[PDB]
RNA sequence: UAAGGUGAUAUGAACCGUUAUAACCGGCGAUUUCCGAAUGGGGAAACCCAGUGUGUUUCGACACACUAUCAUUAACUGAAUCCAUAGGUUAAUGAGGCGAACCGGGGGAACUGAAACAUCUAAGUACCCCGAGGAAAAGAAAUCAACCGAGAUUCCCCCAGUAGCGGCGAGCGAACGGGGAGCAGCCCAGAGCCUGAAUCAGUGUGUGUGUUAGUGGAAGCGUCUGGAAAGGCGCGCGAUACAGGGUGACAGCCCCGUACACAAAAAUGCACAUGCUGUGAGCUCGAUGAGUAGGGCGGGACACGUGGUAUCCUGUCUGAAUAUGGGGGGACCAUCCUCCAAGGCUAAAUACUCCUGACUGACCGAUAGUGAACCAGUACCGUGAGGGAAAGGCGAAAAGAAC
RNA sequence: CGAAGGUGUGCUGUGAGGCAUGCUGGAGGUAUCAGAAGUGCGAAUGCUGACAUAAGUAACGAUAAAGCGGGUGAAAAGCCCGCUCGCCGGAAGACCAAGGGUUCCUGUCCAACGUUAAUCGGGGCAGGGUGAGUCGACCCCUAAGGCGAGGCCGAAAGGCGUAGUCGAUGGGAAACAGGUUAAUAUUCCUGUACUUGGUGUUACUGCGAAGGGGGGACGGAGAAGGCUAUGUUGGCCGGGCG
């Protein structure tokens, strides 16, 4: 009951990174996934001296909405919607436009 | 019976302070935070059976909580019980 | 733990397990108040273990 | 000047405490109205 | 309270009407007296607070059945 | 159902997982400190003090369980006082407290209007108290009617601001009859034939349809502006789905949904058929509710204020006949007509919304809408009852400003 | 390739108004003709918020009174230390009850609070602090009074009251001196004590209540005596000889 899962590869449909692809690192309950190396923000990391302090301006990955990413088809190379079928008694995902299981 | 379970549940923590250290030096007295129920007889029974040390006498006091302010919320801290357990020379 | 494993045990073994779990609980919380237990999470799991034993100590003891 | 409020927790609890409302019918109506409004301090007891 | 045990009579309410038709709330009380009746079934005296019409009822229907319906309604005698 | 989680402010730490007993959601269970009807006694609520019995005593003590009051029933005793009651002990069952409105009953104002005011009005209102239910009350003619007839109660629209009542002022205001909603009748006062008889109240067995978690669910690409396309342009497809909400600007085809087709281990709700427990059914014969109807006095209710005032309820004093009889038909009398009081039960149509879900709005949009969109019955004020605020908005994303 | 709103300008209508467009703004608006109003504000000693004025004006809360040196600090009239001066002293000192509730103590901070400044604080923040057989409560008993099984009375609610049961401001067993913490002490420590119960052997032995008796157990005023608390003086002891 969840289309874009953790270690899936996705393309991006919307944004400054539109069309660019990558694999998903983590999925957050706010309806947002993180895809590494695709949405880079330049945070000013403040040093708080009660630890070891790297400091500086560190670029990291931001959360992108899960509506903006779509599962890569990896055969034709364009984005694809995925649905759920019952290929056998455990419910499984499958690409539309060609009945292929992920 | 359910005696030793109560003995395990009455003790909470050892206290660390300046007065606790001065107590253990000048009087051989340990200071420890107990449960709120904590009669002196069951405190003595618990520290004897669990800590392997004979006990002379036990004094107990009640430490009231301080009404702190966090942000704008007034919140009282929890009310706990302190015990000075005196060990045998 | 495995709750079915405690279902296969008897009254005396579950009572000795309860007293051992409470003893381990006391040791862990005194160690946590003392400064050690970098691994704090065991505290929670030990608490849950005692609760599970008491559940069967009502349930296997009779309805 | 001596003021009207000269406090005492004994007269306070005997006059407006929880058991002094629970003794009479009109005190139980007072408590029903405090619960219907939804007040935090039902009586002055502490 | 002023309740006849046999007839169940209560004080009722109403008005003092004047000669100028002023209405004031008054009460009508029953003609209540405590009288002890000789019951030869249990063969003693039983005191009852009865009205005078209740005494006329006990004179018409005997005391033994009136005590039976008094026991039926669950009163005290 | 599940590949992500350990509630929020609210990061962090240590962990738990991924094919199944991580987490989450649902049914049933377990534990449920103390106060509170508070129930062992007391008390300044959240505290103090016990008694009795059983088992665990390392002998310093533990751990459970019971002990309120009242009503009813039953058993032992039991005075004055032979008898016996009163009284006392014990057990079993039941009740008590709270809750928004609706309902029934016991009490019951005044302001106000009358251009003053006393009868009257407001008004059987506000309020107080008692009691019950998901509805409650009524309810099966001693009713109306008119010489024709209708057939229990309740609710709505007419009749009709009509007859009437009224310092005949202010005001109050029917009924008969008509159209509808919904319709259901019984039983004891007592016996004989008879006992699973037409049915109702409760247990299990089964089915249906619900409720309590859920599952699937269609079809869009290029190009221009732009921070970002869902927008403009072009070219397609789905539709029993173009309700809605999000998505970096306005998306039927990105997502969650929607139409639709489906789903329950276990718990219940309603219908049934089924099986026990109580209960009578149906024919014959009788009986048919007495300090009652009525009356006198004093009040109240009927639209009806004592008036010529019928009818009903009663505080008080009386007091019948008892179906060859009695009530009513608006003073009352006679003739007709119609019914059978002094004993009860009863569904539906009707009223209400603390609370639950869904949907809607020529409703509001932060001085509005609930007092309260924000940790609001809060802060604060008052001895108390009680009164009672102000306060929303960075951005798409903290990328919340290193140096 | 820019909506509402805001802010200017120019046109235009007899008027309420309208149209256009510049800048701001960054997502909405709405023709025409119909329809419905929480439909138009300058006044109500209107209500709510904001902001003026008086005006940098009065005042800065006992006329017990300060001055100097050193320190700290970015900064000292006010803080700390020290030396003088002043004030109270049947209090402006020291212990509590009630009432507050952490205001106590230490470190740190000076936005707001403090009628000024503040390095200070009863302010913010983090930590620490309250030790009892003998003190007090709880406890046993009662007063005034409250509640009150049954009971009596009352439309209902409820009122009064018996046996009981609470109710102190009263009656009831027991601990003193010295030392110690930054903050507690009749609580901790040292020394020396005392009280009440249970339990267990021992010595004798009639004990036993919810009842009887005593005791507890009691006014005002006055006066005298004996003491002590306490103070003064002298002696003694240690220092001084200015």
Curated annotation (Swiss-Prot), chain C:
Disruption phenotype: Cells missing both S17 and L29 grow very slowly and have a rather unstable temperature-sensitive phenotype. Keywords: Ribonucleoprotein, Ribosomal protein, RNA-binding, rRNA-binding. InterPro entries: Ribosomal_protein_uL29, Ribosomal_uL29, Ribosomal_uL29_CS, Ribosomal_uL29_sf. GO terms for molecular function: rRNA binding; structural constituent of ribosome. HAMAP family: Ribosomal_uL29. Belongs to the universal ribosomal protein uL29 family. Binds 23S rRNA. It is not essential for growth. This is Large ribosomal subunit protein uL29. The gene is rpmC.
Curated annotation (Swiss-Prot), chain D:
It comes from the Bacteria. Gene3D superfamilies: 1.10.287.3980. GO terms for molecular function: structural constituent of ribosome. GO terms for biological process: cytoplasmic translation. HAMAP family: Ribosomal_bL34 (MF_00391). Part of the 50S ribosomal subunit. This is Large ribosomal subunit protein bL34.
